[PDB]
Design a protein around this ligand. Structure first.
Ligand SMILES: OC[C@H]1O[C@H](O[C@H]2[C@H](O)[C@@H](O)[C@@H](O[C@H]3[C@H](O)[C@@H](O)[C@@H](O[C@H]4[C@H](O)[C@@H](O)[C@@H](O[C@H]5[C@H](O)[C@@H](O)[C@H](O)O[C@@H]5CO)O[C@@H]4CO)O[C@@H]3CO)O[C@@H]2CO)[C@H](O)[C@@H](O)[C@@H]1O
Ligand SMILES: OC[C@H]1O[C@H](O[C@H]2[C@H](O)[C@@H](O)[C@@H](O[C@H]3[C@H](O)[C@@H](O)[C@@H](O[C@H]4[C@H](O)[C@@H](O)[C@@H](O)O[C@@H]4CO)O[C@@H]3CO)O[C@@H]2CO)[C@H](O)[C@@H](O)[C@@H]1O
Ligand SMILES: OC[C@H]1O[C@H](O[C@H]2[C@H](O)[C@@H](O)[C@@H](O[C@H]3[C@H](O)[C@@H](O)[C@@H](O)O[C@@H]3CO)O[C@@H]2CO)[C@H](O)[C@@H](O)[C@@H]1O
Ligand SMILES: OC[C@H]1O[C@H](O[C@H]2[C@H](O)[C@@H](O)[C@@H](O)O[C@@H]2CO)[C@H](O)[C@@H](O)[C@@H]1O
Ligand SMILES: [Ca+2]
Length: 516
C-alpha cells in the first residue's frame, strides 16, 4: 500500500441488502440461505435500510419496528451479522432507488415556517430529509427514534455488528444539490440549497455574530452592503462558483454552509451514542457521498461538490472524528476521466479522502457507487481498498452477486478475503549504505507490481543479516511477489532473482523465507 504499508488487518467485506423489504423480494427461508452463501463467500455482515417512513408512519411516537425485528430474527437464524441503517431519509428519486418511502409526512407539520425543508437557488423545494439547520426538531425526532429503536432491538444485540446513521439525502451527510426537478442531476453543476427564508436568516445571523456589525462585515469582506438584508447567500450560483468563492465573502459563506453539516454530524453522533452505546456498544458511522463530477472544471472548480456542501474535506472529516463516527466513502470502483463535459475525477477524490482519514486516525470504510457487472471493477475496488488502508468494503447491492454465481466467485476471490499476518524473510540481499528493501506482488494486497507508490517495506535484521517484515496478506489466495531495492533517492536499483509465490497464503500465521 501507500507509505510502505499493507492492507488493513481489520478489513471486512459487507453486503448491502435490497432497498425493499425482503418479503417483497424473496421468502425468509431463502433469505437465510442467501446469507449463509454470502458468508461462505467472505461477507462478514449485511447492511440494511430501516426506513423512517416505515418505523414512525402513523404519527409522532407511533412506532413500528416489526419488520426490523423479523429481519434480525432471520439474520440470527442464519448465524450472520447485520448493520442497521437508521434511514431518516426518503427512499426514491436517487440513483439506483426502486422504492418510494418518504419520511413520515406528519413531520412537516411540526413547524409553520420553512425551517424544515430545502429550497434551491431557483426555488426548488426538497423534502427528502429534514433541513439540518432545524437542530431543535432533529434533536427531538432523531433522539426519540434512536431511543425507541434501541429498546425494540435490544434482544438482537448479539447480531448487530455496527450502526449507520443517515446524515442527509440517499443516506449521506450532504445537501440535495443534484436532483432532476432542480435540473441539477449528474453531470450538471449543483445548486446551493440555502434559499428558504429560515436559511437566509440563519446565514445573516451567523455573519453578524462573527463580525458584530454590518460595518465590520463590509470591512472584512471589502464590500459596500447598504443594510443587513443585503447579507445573503449567492444570488448567482454560476458566478459564485466561477470567482465568488475566492473572496473573503465566499470563504465565509462556504464556512457557514459546510459548517451546518459539521454541526449536524456532531449532533446525530451525540444522539446515536447516547441511544446505542449502553445497549449495543458497537461502532457508529455516517456516510459521505462521492461527488466526482465537475471536479476539475476550469470554469467552475469543484462545481458539484461545493453546492453539495463539500468545500474542505479535512475540516469535514474533523467533525466525524469529534463525533466519534466512522466514515464511509464511495466510488471506489471508478477511474479518473477529468474530461469535458463531466470533468470526473472519482479516483483522485477517493485517494484524497483516504489520505485525510488515515492521517486523522479515522476508521475508513468504502462502497461502490454503481452496480458492478465485471471483474475489472472489482480489481479497481481492490486497488483502492487494500492500498489506502480501508477497514471495510460494502458491495452495492445484494441481487448483483446473489443471482450471479460467476460474479459472486470473482468477488470472493478479489474482495471476500480474510486478512492474515505473515512474516516475509529475504536473504542475501546486496544492499549498500542508504538502500531500502520492499516487496511488491500481483494482487492488489501487494500493490500489483507497483514500486513507486504501493510497495511494502522490509527491515534489515542485523542479527541474521537478512531483511524481514510482518505483512498482512489475503488468506487462502495464491500470490506471486518479488523483493527489490531502492537507493537513497528512491530509484529502483535491482530485483530479486526468482519470482516468489505462495500457493496459497496459509490460513495460519507463519513465515515465507526466500533468497535474493
Ligand atoms: O442502502 C444504502 C443506500 O443506498 C443508496 O444510496 C447509495 C447510492 O446508491 C450510491 O450511489 C452512493 O451515493 C452517491 C454516490 O456516491 C455518488 O457518486 C453519486 O452517484 C452518481 C454517480 O457516481 C454518477 O455516475 C451518476 O450516475 C449515473 C450513471 O453514471 C449512469 O450510468 C446511470 O444511467 O444514471 C446514474 C444517475 O444519473 O450520477 C450519480 C448521482 O445521481 O450520488 C449518489 C447519491 O447520493 O452511496 C449511497 C449510500 O450507500 C440509496 O439511495 C439510499 O437510500 C440507501 O440508504
Ligand atoms: O452577502 C453579500 C452579497 O453576497 C453575494 O454576492 C457575492 C457573489 O455571490 C460572489 O460571486 C461575488 O460576486 C462577484 C461576481 O461573482 C463577479 O462575477 C464580479 O461581479 C460583477 C457582475 O458580473 C456585474 O454584473 C455587476 O454586478 O458588477 C459586479 C462587480 O464587478 O464581481 C462580484 C463582486 O466581486 O461577491 C459578491 C459579494 O461581494 C450575493 O449575490 C449578494 O446578493 C449579497 O448582497
Ligand atoms: O502489469 C501486468 C504484468 O504483470 C506481470 O509482470 C510483473 C512481473 O511478474 C514481476 O516480476 C515484475 O517484473 C520485473 C522483474 O521481476 C524484474 O526482474 C525486472 O525485469 O523488472 C521487471 C519489471 O517490473 O513486475 C511485472 C509488472 O511490472 C506479468 O508477468 C506481465 O506479463 C504482465 O504484463
Ligand atoms: O468549462 C467548460 C464549461 O463549464 C461549465 O459548463 C458545465 C455546466 O455548468 C454543467 O451544468 C454541465 O452542463 O456541464 C457543462 C460542461 O462542463 C460552464 O457553465 C461553461 O460556461 C463552461 O464553458
Ligand atoms: Ca418522535
Amino acid at each position: 500500500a501507500v507509505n510502505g504499508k499493507g492492507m488493513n488487518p481489520d478489513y471486512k467485506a459487507y453486503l448491502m441488502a435490497p432497498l425493499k423489504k425482503i418479503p417483497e423480494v424473496t421468502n425468509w427461508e431463502t433469505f437465510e440461505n442467501d446469507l449463509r452463501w454470502a458468508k461462505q463467500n467472505g461477507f462478514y455482515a449485511i447492511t440494511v435500510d430501516f426506513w423512517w417512513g416505515d418505523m414512525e408512519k402513523n404519527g409522532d411516537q407511533q412506532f413500528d419496528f416489526s419488520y426490523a425485528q423479523r429481519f434480525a430474527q432471520s439474520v440470527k437464524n442464519a448465524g450472520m451479522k447485520m448493520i442497521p441503517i437508521i434511514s431518516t431519509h426518503q427512499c426514491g428519486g436517487n440513483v439506483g432507488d426502486d422504492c418510494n418511502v418518504p419520511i413520515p409526512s406528519w413531520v412537516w407539520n411540526q413547524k409553520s415556517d420553512d425551517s424544515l425543508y430545502f429550497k434551491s437557488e431557483t426555488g426548488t423545494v426538497n423534502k427528502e430529509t429534514l433541513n439540518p439547520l432545524a437542530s431543535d426538531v432533529i434533536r427531538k425526532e432523531y433522539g426519540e427514534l434512536y431511543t425507541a429503536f434501541a429498546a425494540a432491538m435490544k434482544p438482537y444485540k448479539d447480531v448487530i455488528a455496527k450502526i449507520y446513521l443517515s446524515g442527509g439525502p440517499a443516506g449521506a451527510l450532504r445537501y440535495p444539490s443534484y436532483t432532476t426537478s432542480d435540473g441539477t442531476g449528474y453531470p450538471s453543476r449543483g445548486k446551493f440549497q440555502a434559499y428558504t427564508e429560515f436559511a437566509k436568516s440563519k446565514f445573516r445571523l451567523w455573519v453578524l455574530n462573527k463580525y458584530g456589525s454590518l460595518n465590520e462585515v463590509n470591512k472584512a469582506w471589502g464590500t459596500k452592503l447598504i443594510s443587513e438584508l443585503a447579507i445573503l447567500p449567492p444570488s448567482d450560483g454560476e458566478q459564485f462558483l466561477m470567482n465568488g468563492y475566492l473572496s473573503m465573502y465566499g470563504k465565509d459563506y462556504l464556512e457557514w454552509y459546510q459548517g451546518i453539516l459539521e454541526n449536524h454530524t456532531k449532533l446525530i453522533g451525540e444522539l446515536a451514542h447516547n441511544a446505542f452505546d449502553t445497549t449495543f456498544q458497537v461502532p457508529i458511522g455516517a456516510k459521505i457521498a462521492g461527488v466526482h463530477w465537475q471536479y476539475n472544471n476550469p470554469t467552475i472548480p469543484h462545481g458539484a461538490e461545493k453546492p453539495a456542501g463539500y468545500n474542505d474535506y479535512s475540516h469535514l472529516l474533523d467533525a466525524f472524528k469529534s463525533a466519534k463516527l466512522d466514515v464511509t466513502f464511495t466510488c471506489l470502483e471508478m477511474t479518473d476521466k477529468g474530461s469535458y463535459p463531466e470533468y470526473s475525477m472519482p479516483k483522485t477524490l477517493v485517494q484524497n479522502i483516504a489520505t485525510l482519514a488515515n492521517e486523522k486516525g479515522i476508521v475508513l470504510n468504502g462502497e461502490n457507487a454503481l452496480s458492478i457487472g465485471n471483474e475489472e471493477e472489482y480489481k479497481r475496488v481492490a486497488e483502492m481498498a487494500f492500498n489506502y488502508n480501508f477497514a471495510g468494503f460494502t458491495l452495492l447491492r445484494y441481487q448483483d452477486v446473489m443471482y450471479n454465481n460467476s460474479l459472486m466467485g470473482k468477488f470472493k476471490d478479489l474482495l471476500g478475503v480474510t486478512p492474515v499476518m505473515q512474516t516475509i524473510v529475504v536473504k542475501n540481499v546486496p544492499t549498500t549504505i542508504g538502500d531500502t528493501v520492499y516487496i511488491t506482488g500481483n494482487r492488489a494486497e501487494l500493490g500489483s507490481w507497483d514500486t513507486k507508490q504501493y510497495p511494502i517495506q522490509l527491515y534489515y535484521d542485523s542479527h541474521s543479516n537478512d531483511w524481514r517484515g510482518n505483512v498482512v496478506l489475503p488468506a487462502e489466495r495464491n500470490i506471486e511477489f518479488k523483493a527489490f531495492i531502492k537507493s537513497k533517492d528512491g530509484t529502483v536499483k535491482s530485483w530479486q532473482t526468482i519470482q516468489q509465490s505462495w500457493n496459497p497464503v496459509p490460513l495460519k500465521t507463519t513465515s515465507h523465507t526466500s533468497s535474493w
